[PDB]
Design an enzyme around this catalytic site. Sequence first.
Site, PDB file in Angstrom:
ATOM      1  N   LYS E  63       5.021   9.732  -3.608  1.00 32.27           N
ATOM      2  CA  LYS E  63       4.512   8.397  -3.867  1.00 32.27           C
ATOM      3  C   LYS E  63       4.975   7.952  -5.247  1.00 32.27           C
ATOM      4  CE  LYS E  63       2.383   4.708  -3.728  1.00 32.27           C
ATOM      5  NZ  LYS E  63       2.222   3.744  -2.634  1.00 32.27           N
ATOM      6  N   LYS E  87      -0.358  12.047 -12.347  1.00 31.43           N
ATOM      7  CA  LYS E  87      -1.336  11.024 -11.994  1.00 31.43           C
ATOM      8  C   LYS E  87      -1.999  11.355 -10.663  1.00 31.43           C
ATOM      9  CE  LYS E  87       1.637   7.410 -14.003  1.00 31.43           C
ATOM     10  NZ  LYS E  87       1.989   5.959 -13.957  1.00 31.43           N
ATOM     11  N   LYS E  99       9.735   8.749  -7.139  1.00 37.98           N
ATOM     12  CA  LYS E  99      10.132   7.619  -7.975  1.00 37.98           C
ATOM     13  C   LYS E  99      11.507   7.089  -7.600  1.00 37.98           C
ATOM     14  CE  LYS E  99       8.143   5.323 -11.431  1.00 37.98           C
ATOM     15  NZ  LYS E  99       6.710   4.909 -11.477  1.00 37.98           N
ATOM     16  N   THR E 183      -5.544  -1.622 -12.784  1.00 40.04           N
ATOM     17  CA  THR E 183      -5.425  -0.878 -14.041  1.00 40.04           C
ATOM     18  C   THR E 183      -6.592  -1.164 -14.981  1.00 40.04           C
ATOM     19  OG1 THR E 183      -2.998  -0.834 -13.914  1.00 40.04           O
ATOM     20  CG2 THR E 183      -3.993  -0.390 -16.061  1.00 40.04           C
ATOM     21  N   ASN E 214      -3.011  -9.188 -22.283  1.00 41.20           N
ATOM     22  CA  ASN E 214      -3.304  -9.360 -20.866  1.00 41.20           C
ATOM     23  C   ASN E 214      -4.370  -8.384 -20.378  1.00 41.20           C
ATOM     24  OD1 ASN E 214      -2.432  -9.560 -17.713  1.00 41.20           O
ATOM     25  ND2 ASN E 214      -1.598 -11.285 -18.883  1.00 41.20           N
ATOM     26  N   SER E 326      -2.850   1.484  -4.981  1.00 37.64           N
ATOM     27  CA  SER E 326      -1.636   1.582  -4.184  1.00 37.64           C
ATOM     28  C   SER E 326      -1.873   2.617  -3.089  1.00 37.64           C
ATOM     29  CB  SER E 326      -0.438   1.977  -5.054  1.00 37.64           C
ATOM     30  OG  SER E 326      -0.287   3.386  -5.134  1.00 37.64           O
TER      31      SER E 326
END
Lengths: 407, 378, 392, 378, 392
Positions: E63, E87, E99, E183, E214, E326
């Site tokens: 993933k 992760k 990736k 996030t 942001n 995700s």
Amino acid sequence: VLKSTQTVIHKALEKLGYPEEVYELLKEPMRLLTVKIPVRMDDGSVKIFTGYRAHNDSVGPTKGGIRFHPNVTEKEVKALSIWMSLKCGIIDLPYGGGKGGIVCDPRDMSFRELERLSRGYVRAISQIVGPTKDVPAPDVFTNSQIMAWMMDEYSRIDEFNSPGFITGKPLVLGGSHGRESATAKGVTICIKEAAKKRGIDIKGARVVVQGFGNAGSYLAKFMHDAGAKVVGISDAYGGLYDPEGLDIDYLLDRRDSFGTVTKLFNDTITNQELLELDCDILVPAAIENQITEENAHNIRAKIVVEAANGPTTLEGTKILSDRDILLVPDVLASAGGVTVSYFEWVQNNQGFYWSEEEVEEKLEKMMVKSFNNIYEMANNRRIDMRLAAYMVGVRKMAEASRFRGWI
Amino acid sequence: VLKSTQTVIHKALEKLGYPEEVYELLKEPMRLLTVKIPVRMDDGSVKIFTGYRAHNDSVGPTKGGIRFHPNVTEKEVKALSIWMSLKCGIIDLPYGGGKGGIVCDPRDMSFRELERLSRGYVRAISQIVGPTKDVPAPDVFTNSQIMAWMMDEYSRIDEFNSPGFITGKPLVLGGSHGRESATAKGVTICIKEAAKKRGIDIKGARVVVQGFGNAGSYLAKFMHDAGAKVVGISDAYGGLYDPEGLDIDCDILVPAAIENQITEENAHNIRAKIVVEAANGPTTLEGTKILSDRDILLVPDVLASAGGVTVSYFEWVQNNQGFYWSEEEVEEKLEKMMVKSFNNIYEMANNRRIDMRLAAYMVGVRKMAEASRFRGWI
Amino acid sequence: VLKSTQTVIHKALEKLGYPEEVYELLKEPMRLLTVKIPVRMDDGSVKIFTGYRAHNDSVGPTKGGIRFHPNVTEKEVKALSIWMSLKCGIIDLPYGGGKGGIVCDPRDMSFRELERLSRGYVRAISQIVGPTKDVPAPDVFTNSQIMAWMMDEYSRIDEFNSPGFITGKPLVLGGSHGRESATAKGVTICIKEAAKKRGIDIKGARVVVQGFGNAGSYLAKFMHDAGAKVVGISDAYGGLYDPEGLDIDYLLDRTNQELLELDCDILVPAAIENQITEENAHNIRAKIVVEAANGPTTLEGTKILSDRDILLVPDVLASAGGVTVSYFEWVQNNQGFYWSEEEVEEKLEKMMVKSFNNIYEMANNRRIDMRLAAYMVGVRKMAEASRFRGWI
Amino acid sequence: VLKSTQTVIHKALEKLGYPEEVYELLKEPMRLLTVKIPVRMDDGSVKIFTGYRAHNDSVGPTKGGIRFHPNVTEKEVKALSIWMSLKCGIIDLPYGGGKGGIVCDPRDMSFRELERLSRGYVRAISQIVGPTKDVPAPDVFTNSQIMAWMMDEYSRIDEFNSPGFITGKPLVLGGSHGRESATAKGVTICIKEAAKKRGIDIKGARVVVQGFGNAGSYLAKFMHDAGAKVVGISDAYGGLYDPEGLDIDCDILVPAAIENQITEENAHNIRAKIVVEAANGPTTLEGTKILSDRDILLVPDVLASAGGVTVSYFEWVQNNQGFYWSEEEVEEKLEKMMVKSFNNIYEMANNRRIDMRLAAYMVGVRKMAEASRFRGWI
Amino acid sequence: VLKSTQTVIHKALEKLGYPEEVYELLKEPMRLLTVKIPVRMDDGSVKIFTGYRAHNDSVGPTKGGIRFHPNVTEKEVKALSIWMSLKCGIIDLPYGGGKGGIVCDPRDMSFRELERLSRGYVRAISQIVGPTKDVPAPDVFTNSQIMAWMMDEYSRIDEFNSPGFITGKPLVLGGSHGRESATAKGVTICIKEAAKKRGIDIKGARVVVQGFGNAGSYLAKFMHDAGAKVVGISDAYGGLYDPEGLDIDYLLDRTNQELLELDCDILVPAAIENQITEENAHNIRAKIVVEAANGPTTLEGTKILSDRDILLVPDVLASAGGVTVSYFEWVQNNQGFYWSEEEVEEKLEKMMVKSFNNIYEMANNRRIDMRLAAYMVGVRKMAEASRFRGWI
């Protein structure tokens, strides 16, 4: 039967100097699938038929027919699967041995029922079977029509035409020329070779054939047309005898779908008398264990060619040797079926089909080649055809299993 | 129209003695897929093309071309799929009939647009086609380049080279030698073989080829090279005659032109002993009868022209083997199959006291009828 | 190095008249898989081997061997994959070039360790290989046994016998007759065919084979049996000359400057690189030079021989016998039908002849040497295919 | 022996009112695969192990463990596969019964040998098993490590992670929380639920657990923590009694030991109002009757112990989702299913005036009988 | 560089007590595919783009996202694939790290060119990816539209809708709610959970957010709405301080040295790297530091904060919100059932909480910082799986 096949394979293996481990691996099919098959019967009832599919060995896709008989058993199916590996080794095809069996009696079933059961068989085993895995064929009480039904069922499951799945198909479904009678033609060639080997003239030779099935009948005819005297013939119910050679054309005239013809006569003889018929060439084309310890000394033929699987026992075979009789083993003589089956499968692989002449030629070339390899190695080794044939027919499987890391 | 094909199918089955149910089975494709294909046009727009793929009968993988034409219709591709079965039966191929069509005008489409459409077409029907299922080919306005694109697309979907998906490919993509001359050569084989039946030596045979176009001219060179007195040829403005033989550089009449040349109005006039059709419907139904009543051997277009299909089949076989045939090897196999086919049809016509047209139809329809019955469909 | 292969590719495409973009496409494998393979070692440890599988170009299933060698590199297997395309184009195979490599030293590995690695290699790359995708073969330190293991592993993953996955298999596993003599025989066919072009009867032809090693000795027997006066042979310690013809048979059963400068019809350099150099190229008496080894003749020498009317048959074409028979094995696998030794022989001949002649005729028409023309023919097929399929 | 299982199957179908043909269908696995597996032994030799995989009935993917034991037999794995259907029917799983066995002695095999065998076993049967076909699990001498190896092997064959192929996996490989306590907890749920039916408050209920072994001790802690007076426990050397309640740190009898504790010879002696079996065949056939004649509620082992199977099912579900359940989530679903199952069986037994044993058998056998009929097998 | 990732992997394995061989296994992707993708450009030309897809470890489907950037490198995508494992281990996903990367500049490519490339990329790697094999996602210059194209292409190859092949899809193509805030929300969960550990009520907690960009602005609204005194924020031109608490909603509608040294309970560095250095680490008044950005605190600073009782929540854990959602999208794809915005939220929370707590407790038990403990937890799962499956 299986026990016996194993003694000779063990002897074979050992005689070639193999580790015990190879026998252990070959002595039994590596994969046996037994299945229960529900069948809607015409009488509105539902019957559970027991099926078997055996893969002796995979160093090559497995190959072998499917029989429909009440007397089929798991044990018979294993032994039959082992025969087949040997036949493919003997003829030298890229096959492993396989066989199928459904406990049933097609004599007591209808056309529609047989189809449902045929389709039921394919549906039970489709997962471990197919053009590239395991290619079945006719055997006892199955014909091209049963292959056609099964082929269709498999094709619907794989969602495209899968001719290579199963051999003995009708010509119009990618069947091969020569397959229908291939078994007999295979025994014939084997007889001719054994005849020429013994200085026996087929031109007027007296040949007795036990069994009048697909192998038996076509055989008798091929011997008749070869100019031989087919003096003794039989189905399950008895024998017909005529020292001058039975009217074969007529006998397979009165013959029915299942290879019986004896009942129409009252001057019939027993099957065990038939096996002792005075003659040159005896051809067991029926059930197993017909030449035992207790009639091996009583057989008058100098040449005995096994068209049926395991027609003679161990001692039956030793005895036949003791008294200088030429025995062409089943794993050789009956292998015309596979050989032409194999052609059919090549033609299926390619999508291009051979003429009768091409099949007839290739068939003959391989059989003759196989008889000689066995006959010669039986010579050089001071051993019988059985042990010799087994040594030929086990060579590849033992070598391939070794190369591939199984043993 | 579609019924015309069905009439032939019925007539032929009728004569074979098959029950009405078999006709019912074979009268329509057992499988029809019609699709809408979005194509990005160069002008930035998006046009939705309608495509069809028909599988007449599955007693073997289906086989048949794809046409790009404004006037192609579902009814047409259906009909044509059935005709492919006939041919396949006639040549004894391990095939069933299939056919494709896209409603479009290639003449008004650009190179990159035609590619998009071709890929879209494969993307649309990929689920039901392939080397083992349904093998397309070129037709009306499709060619080897279109075949190439389609093959590339199909290969991407399988994730491996699938040459045998579609025939008429360029040689480098697994195409086969002997496409160019396939049809013409197939005719020549029928002509020679017909000669043998009528005890006519080719070496002096007076041959007449109507139409000195593309297939006609070819046929003329083939007879003249075979030592026949090509005593006559014609294009569109009359014909040449020369009893001594025209140096292309009667016994056999090869109508290689248009329909309805041999009619009731002139059928009794034909001097030829053998008429081999090298075109579509050159002889009316009456003319076919008249020639039959007279001892004139009429070789049916459906058999005479099967050269193209046969070589397309060879390409597929070569694809299966992954081994490719020399030009000579293609030639000989083309001959053996044409000869074998001519003779089955000739002998059935002779045994059954009917013309070769009708007997070809029977042989073309008989194989899938036997197969369908064997497999329990009927 | 890898650029050397790319230079050839570029030059060849250049001459064919293909645009720069085609070169850009063909210069690298369109697909490279590099993998880490854990192997349980006999000493109980675990060693991670690095493997590569390269697919140069897919205009047909890719095809090429796998080497087990300490010095194999990603750059190398890439380069080699491209050379496989060339050969495949040269023989007109329905293949594209592929190549494998594992960084390991088989000489220091046990039997069971080499098997584990072989299976691990297949396990690692199974997703992108197979009978229809990418067909490996033996190479440097790999053999029929390794092929067998790999085949068995791949078959387990498919859940059915997949002989056509990998070639160079033992006969019992669907291997093909005629591997042993494949390369040598391919050379012999080029020699005979070259003879025909120069109007040289073989029956009296003076033949010179440099290197009486393995392929050399074989070539000598083939000419001597074909009735050629094998007027000279050499191993590593000089050469034998005899105008009457050396009875090679007498020698199977038992300088170098000079051997090459021998007055002969056919010179077959079956030894090492750089035998035919600018320094002696004008000295060569032979009318035909057929390379039976790698780079026996420098670039100049190739030119010099060209300026002179000496026909130089390129190693890349002469040695394509091996690849060709590996292809036959794959075909037989597809059919499930296996060819007699004779049948293999004849097909090997027809393809070599067909290949020699396409290359000879292009060289003749285009006024260039056979080396360059072979390169063009080797590179042209996948260029046409790639264009036909809309890749370029 | 195998007939014992078939007798139960027949009896149960009989009572449901199914025709003899249904019994004929269900009496044997519709699919049996027996295989020979070559394993390289550490001593350099090669040993051929015999393995079996049985699919009783396919009205849902089959499900069942694999045992490594010298005494496992084809007849045994056949029988056991059928029992798995029963359990699956009892818990209402979307499964059919399956079972595996290898004739070997793990106790005499090394770590690396057991791995080779496990992989060989998967290699042998991969064609007919998988996340959607047949989901094995641990049994007699197999564990999570064996499961892991098998899972790894199967994943290699599919060329992708296939956790759902086999359950009882380690957590990191997609195993499920709550395996350890699965069976015991399943019993506790049956005990509580049985209490409710007999109007017996748990908070003061006198509970007796025979066998203070592994499941017994656990059950005792569960009642004592639930506020029951665990008035008695026993191991192998007698028992403890204390009316006030034994501090584990009658109303309900939980035989958690050996077979034939409740016999005709003492069945009338049982003071308990509820008997919940936490072991195999603790009560003879007579005893089961006697308890029935008396108003003693006997909860069948086949239902009480279905906790293990149920959680193995949860693991498979989680595998399907690719999402893994908290320990609490497993617990509650385990409860809902056990409760749902207990109650279907209790209510059928009540409506039909028969014991819970027999009614469980009917419920265990009824689902695949309905499915098999719906799908036209019978 | 790639070694930096490997150092972390080694250190973490080291501390877990795994043998060197495990590190050797995990140090590189067990599978790397690099591909050449021909794209027809609008100007009529053809450009060959280089793409990479790396599968670090297969103890679960791999993933990870795909970036389109001129500076992406094989070494980079390799490294990044490994970080994805970390992760995934950290969140306890049933994944392994993967990736993707394409060497291109999307900013110079047209809409239709980017689509061609995306489809070509899938066409190139389809054999080794998919819903059960390897699930890509958006990254640097890739988005939901690119994801859509890739998904469409992959679906065409399978001949059926394969939503679960790639995540970050538009909602109509089986995307998932809660990506936008993933996030940020993940950070908020770590902040709250860290609070609980230090016995810090959120309702009055003095919170400092560096960077009012942001993610920073978002974090400020989240604390201010949670009743925290967001006593300080900063953008690029200094910071605001107000002990009473800044009304972020004002600020929301509408120096840095000081902002960081501010008296507070929770410091959320949501800006750039190296804000917390040895030079000022002893100055930090905050009791908890939750990283909402990459490497805000040097190695020393991490130590210093450790020596002091300052709880430092590692970016690798704090930012795992995106990956987690995700993953949810992929799960929903598997079910063919799609989650409400609330359902996504709660599951995101349970996993973050579960993850924070495993990492916190290991750090506490083992007397080490949360950074290092996260690394161990991130690396431990695939180490256990790889061992269980007999790879090591």
